[PDB]
Amino acid sequence: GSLTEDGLSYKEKFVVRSYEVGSNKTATVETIANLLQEVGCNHAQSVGFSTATTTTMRKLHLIWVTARMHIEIYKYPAWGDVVEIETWCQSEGRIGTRRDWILKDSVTGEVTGRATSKWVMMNQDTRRLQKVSDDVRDEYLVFCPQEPRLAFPEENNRSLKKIPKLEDPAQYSMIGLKPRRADLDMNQHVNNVTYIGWVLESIPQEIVDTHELQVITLDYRRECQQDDVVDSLTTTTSDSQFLHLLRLSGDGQEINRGTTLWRKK
Amino acid sequence: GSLTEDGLSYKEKFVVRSYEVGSNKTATVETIANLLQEVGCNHAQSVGFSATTTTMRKLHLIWVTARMHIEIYKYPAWGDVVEIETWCQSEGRIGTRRDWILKDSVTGEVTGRATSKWVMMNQDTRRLQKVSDDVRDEYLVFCPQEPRLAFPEENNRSLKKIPKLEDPAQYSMIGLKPRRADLDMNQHVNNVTYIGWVLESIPQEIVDTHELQVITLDYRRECQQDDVVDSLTTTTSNDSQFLHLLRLSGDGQEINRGTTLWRKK
């Protein structure tokens, strides 16, 4: 992959692997979510970040953490196909950061999906959220479009809707979910993609067999740690819509909420 | 990737991805095992398969893994290119072998090797059988005719008999369940998942302070989507050796056994 001409966005091509696809021989949403995160990392390497901590962030032990992940897929790429992913970052002034992605058929050049994500600043030791400094903004505005560039430009759009809290009892549930070493990143934290899978695990197999996932919106409230256990809850709200809750098996502490939308095949 | 000049082997290059690495910023043995399966699949595609031959599709026959053997000298680093070569060979009427060599792309030196034994099984009845001449002949056109062994040595750890762990196990991980990211395109648990499940009963202190050199895994029965696995480990030993058993948490039915060898970092 490479920075584009203006050095304000990054593109990479990926061949869809045998193990990356589900029962219709197209990419899972989790494969897709892993590819967004790889091209996010490849963009940060290309422009000097880490080896996405800036020099000021390293000083005060500050990190970016995902608050929100929104993905819309029109077509899942097939086993053996090339997908082109472009990604850029923007400042939401002092609130935090946004990363946006556009997914294209390499062969046709047509948009096959789009994703947006909200990142906020956290201490790392104390895990306390805060506003972005100001000294920090200047150091990464050099790497972002100055004019707004939005994967989801439409005024009132799915990617910005408030998500309510599922009320007990849930229509469906998958209890006793536990991460393994394959679910951890290189800093030994549970990978953000794992949560996407744990949310999807309470959807009935019959919906998955007969529908395609078109939109997922997931809020991240709190981390699941190595020795935690998650319950996954789902109620139909409706094309079919679901409301989703991830919480710890014990004390029922919320880790995530979300919604998904599925089309009939 | 592509077939070599003689068309009796297949080569492919892989860039190691952000999410594919552990705490050393090098590839996990599960990332390695996934890459081996992708190059195995790309070789079968290249020589005209879809990995069943005409006669097997007629008789509803498939290859299934009886054994995986993997030895790693160096785990490739995040961003590095690993080159993997692969070929099959007939083992008479017993089954087939698939063998792999991993190289540093930049240096050309061998950094891993792996060998696997596959047997013929009825898709439906799940009954093992010997390989028939009509089938042996259909796939010898793709295999080197002289022997080519990744593990040639006369007394080599890839062929040793593996004993059954005796209760009580020294270590255990209880209540392991596949999620949908553990399934392949045919909705069977991925052979790499059992590797991860075997590794989950190794204490974190061994993993933090040692590197996996060798893994040998036997495949007895598969885990269904709605089964639950227990993972057991006893130390059997400068080098730490362990003995492994995966079994179904209910009735204690054996799904896998194996051994691992680790060196101090």
Ligand SMILES: O=c1ccc(OC(F)F)c[nH]1
């Ligand atoms: O561990 C955390 C804490 C917070 C968060 O999101 C923030 F917006 F609330 C994500 N992950």
Ligand SMILES: O=c1ccc(OC(F)F)c[nH]1
């Ligand atoms: O379901 C099966 C059938 C066979 C097998 O391998 C064979 F060696 F036992 C593994 N898993």
